[PDB]
Every structure is written in structure tokens, then in C-alpha cells.
């Protein structure tokens, strides 16, 4: 299973997205972070072209437990980089599962020619198995 880390020039830090920054967001007050219910946010809150119909339930102040990868917009329309130049699940519809699973077409863009699909490999599989097995001779010989 080959995969590319989901880097997107279209993603931003959750906090850069929120319009009304509340104490409960920024502060990072422990007392709160441990007792509030999850938070329902939409892909719109994470990408500029984020599909708003895609709602995900994240853990409070989870944006303080992790930092997102950055790609200067300029790489936006540059054919050749394995980035998600289009907000995840932007062509599968308001369906979360479809956004989460890896759409391999998202990559057709960066390959000069999938004559051997996206990837390909050549390897030697050395296998040794001990087992109760008569010898070929014993199989072909009757007497």
C-alpha cells in the first residue's frame, strides 16, 4: 500500500479559519479542554475550497495538539507535485467516507505517463517451507 502524505496548499490552521476567536479556542484552558463535548466542524473550516457539507467531529483544542503541513499556494496549479491541489473529497460530494479514502485520481496530475499505473515494483520472494511431502519420485513411482 503506497500513499502520499495529504499535503495541500489549500489547507490552513483551524485557528486561522475561525472568524470569532473565543477564549475557549485560543486560551487552551485545561479546565475546559477536558470537559467539553466534541466539536462539529466542516471541511470549509480547514480548506479554502473546503466542502461545507462534510462535517467531522473533532476533539476540543485538537488544533493545539497538532500542527498542519504548509504549501505556499503557488504550488496550487503546478503539475508534478504529489500534493492534494484540491481540498480532500472535493469531487466525491458531501460524503465524508469518500473524502477520507484515498482517491488515486488526485494524483494522475503529477505523473508523466501511467504506463505502469501510479507505482510499480519488482522483487524476489524467497520462500522456504518445511512440510510433510512425499518426493516427486514417490509421486510418479507406483512400485
Amino acid at each position: 500500500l503506497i500513499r502520499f502524505p495529504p499535503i495541500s496548499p489549500l489547507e490552513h490552521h483551524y485557528l486561522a479559519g475561525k472568524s470569532q476567536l473565543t477564549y475557549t479556542d485560543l486560551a487552551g484552558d485545561p479546565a475546559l479542554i477536558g470537559n467539553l463535548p466534541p466539536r462539529e466542524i466542516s471541511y470549509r473550516d480547514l480548506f479554502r475550497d473546503g466542502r461545507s457539507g462534510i462535517k467531522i467531529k473533532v476533539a476540543e483544542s485538537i488544533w493545539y495538539r497538532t500542527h498542519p503541513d504548509y504549501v505556499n499556494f503557488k504550488y496550487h496549479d503546478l503539475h508534478g507535485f504529489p500534493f492534494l491541489d484540491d481540498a480532500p473529497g472535493t469531487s466525491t460530494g458531501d460524503n465524508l467516507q469518500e473524502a477520507i479514502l484515498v482517491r488515486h485520481q488526485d494524483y494522475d496530475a503529477c505523473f508523466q505517463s501511467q504506463q505502469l499505473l501510479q507505482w510499480n515494483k519488482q522483487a524476489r520472494y524467497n520462500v522456504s517451507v518445511y512440510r510433510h511431502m512425499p518426493t516427486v519420485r514417490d509421486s510418479i513411482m507406483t512400485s
Binding site: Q122, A123, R124, T135, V136, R137, I140
Partner: peptide
């Protein structure tokens, strides 16, 4: 993860005999 620079694959080559064909065949 192995360092080396990609090598082409060789022979598909053990226990006892498998191929009986009447005698020696190269």
C-alpha cells in the same frame, strides 16, 4: 528501507528433485 541502488532480479532458484524427464536436459 534498504540503501543500495536497484538491482535487476536473477534466477527463480532447495530440496530434493522435481523434474523427471527421462535423463539429463540442460
Amino acid at each position: 528501507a534498504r540503501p543500495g541502488r536497484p538491482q535487476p532480479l536473477r534466477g527463480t532458484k532447495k530440496g530434493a528433485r522435481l523434474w523427471y524427464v527421462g535423463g539429463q536436459q540442460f
